[PDB]
Design a protein around this motif. Structure first.
Motif, PDB file in Angstrom:
ATOM      1  N   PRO A 146      10.161 -14.780  38.017  1.00  0.00           N
ATOM      2  CA  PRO A 146      10.193 -15.771  36.934  1.00  0.00           C
ATOM      3  C   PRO A 146      10.450 -15.166  35.567  1.00  0.00           C
ATOM      4  O   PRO A 146      11.069 -15.824  34.724  1.00  0.00           O
ATOM      5  N   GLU A 147       9.990 -13.941  35.312  1.00  0.00           N
ATOM      6  CA  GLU A 147      10.191 -13.341  33.996  1.00  0.00           C
ATOM      7  C   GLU A 147      11.659 -13.022  33.755  1.00  0.00           C
ATOM      8  O   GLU A 147      12.196 -13.309  32.681  1.00  0.00           O
TER       9      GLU A 147
ATOM     10  N   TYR B  16      13.366 -16.158  33.164  1.00  0.00           N
ATOM     11  CA  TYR B  16      12.907 -16.696  31.889  1.00  0.00           C
ATOM     12  C   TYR B  16      13.597 -16.012  30.719  1.00  0.00           C
ATOM     13  O   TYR B  16      14.156 -16.673  29.840  1.00  0.00           O
TER      14      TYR B  16
ATOM     15  N   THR C  76      17.277 -16.484  30.496  1.00  0.00           N
ATOM     16  CA  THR C  76      17.599 -17.776  29.906  1.00  0.00           C
ATOM     17  C   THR C  76      17.582 -17.710  28.388  1.00  0.00           C
ATOM     18  O   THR C  76      18.421 -18.327  27.727  1.00  0.00           O
ATOM     19  N   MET C  77      16.631 -16.978  27.813  1.00  0.00           N
ATOM     20  CA  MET C  77      16.618 -16.812  26.367  1.00  0.00           C
ATOM     21  C   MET C  77      17.877 -16.106  25.891  1.00  0.00           C
ATOM     22  O   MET C  77      18.446 -16.469  24.858  1.00  0.00           O
TER      23      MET C  77
ATOM     24  N   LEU D 233      20.549 -18.748  26.023  1.00  0.00           N
ATOM     25  CA  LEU D 233      20.384 -19.737  24.965  1.00  0.00           C
ATOM     26  C   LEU D 233      20.791 -19.172  23.614  1.00  0.00           C
ATOM     27  O   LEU D 233      21.384 -19.879  22.793  1.00  0.00           O
ATOM     28  N   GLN D 234      20.471 -17.909  23.354  1.00  0.00           N
ATOM     29  CA  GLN D 234      20.828 -17.315  22.073  1.00  0.00           C
ATOM     30  C   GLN D 234      22.337 -17.301  21.870  1.00  0.00           C
ATOM     31  O   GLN D 234      22.827 -17.636  20.787  1.00  0.00           O
TER      32      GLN D 234
ATOM     33  N   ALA E  76      23.671 -20.884  21.365  1.00  0.00           N
ATOM     34  CA  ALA E  76      23.299 -21.417  20.061  1.00  0.00           C
ATOM     35  C   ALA E  76      24.079 -20.750  18.937  1.00  0.00           C
ATOM     36  O   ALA E  76      24.397 -21.401  17.938  1.00  0.00           O
TER      37      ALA E  76
ATOM     38  N   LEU F 216      30.380 -25.470  14.406  1.00  0.00           N
ATOM     39  CA  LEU F 216      30.194 -26.452  13.346  1.00  0.00           C
ATOM     40  C   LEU F 216      30.626 -25.899  11.995  1.00  0.00           C
ATOM     41  O   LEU F 216      31.213 -26.623  11.184  1.00  0.00           O
TER      42      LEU F 216
END
Lengths: 63, 170
Positions: free
Chosen positions: A3-4, A7, A10-11, A14-15, A18, A25
């Protein structure tokens, strides 16, 4: 996978997504201002090159 | 085998046999047959198996999750914090679901245990069930399939505002 790892992987995902999103934009806003104002590298339409002008004295004096 | 505080069980009061009949009780003889024929061989097999388990002994652990900032401390569109806060909210959501299950198991055990007297002897179990279900309803009800800590927070703020105004009516 633990899981780590999933986990923190995923960060990392996501970074990146993002950072890509914020730049997408900003690019639209920059293109909005460059095209409207014409003061940037983009939408720089050509004008006549002043190096084509001849400044030598002419046959007549008023020019 | 399990925590007697999480799953409480009132003490067992069983009458002593007080026969008033000369005939032999079949249940008494059948109970002895069961213990000789079924219980003892089943008990010998288990003792053998447990001996193997006392030679290969090893452990597993209950995962401990560090607390992280809630969605209330996350800046708008800050995914990295929103992610960790959101995962925590989901973990607590699933734990809260099983808490309500525990309380429901207590209520259903009481109803069976007390028999015809259950209406009066299961009051404390019924009151606690009402309180937890009310709390669970306030936290999580009506969020929808796409629930999230953000939606859960918005639902609370709406309730905190409505309570604040009703308070201001005083």
């Amino acid at each position: 996978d633990g899981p780590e790892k999933n986990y923190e992987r995923t960060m990392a995902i996501l970074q990146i997504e993002a950072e890509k999103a914020e730049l997408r934009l900003k690019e639209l806003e920059v293109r909005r201002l460059m095209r409207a104002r014409g003061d940037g590298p983009w939408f720089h339409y050509p004008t006549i090159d002043k190096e084509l002008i001849d400044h030598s004295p002419k046959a007549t004096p008023d020019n | 085998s399990w925590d007697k505080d999480v799953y409480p069980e009132p003490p067992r009061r069983t009458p002593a046999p007080s026969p008033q009949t000369s005939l032999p009780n079949p249940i008494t003889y059948l109970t002895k047959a069961f213990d000789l024929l079924v219980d003892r061989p089943v008990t010998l097999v288990r003792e053998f198996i447990e001996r193997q388990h006392a030679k290969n002994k090893y452990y597993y652990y209950h995962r401990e999750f560090r607390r992280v900032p809630d969605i209330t401390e996350c800046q708008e569109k800050d995914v990295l914090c929103m992610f960790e806060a959101e995962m925590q909210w989901r973990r607590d959501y699933k734990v809260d679901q099983e808490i309500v299950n525990i309380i429901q198991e207590r209520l259903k055990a009481c109803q069976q245990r007390e028999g015809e007297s259950h209406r009066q002897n299961c009051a404390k179990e019924l009151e606690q069930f009402t309180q937890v279900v009310k709390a669970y309803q306030d936290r999580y009800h009506d969020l929808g399939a796409h629930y999230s800590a953000r939606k859960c927070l918005a639902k609370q703020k709406q309730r905190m505002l409505a309570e604040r105004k009703a308070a201001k009516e005083a």
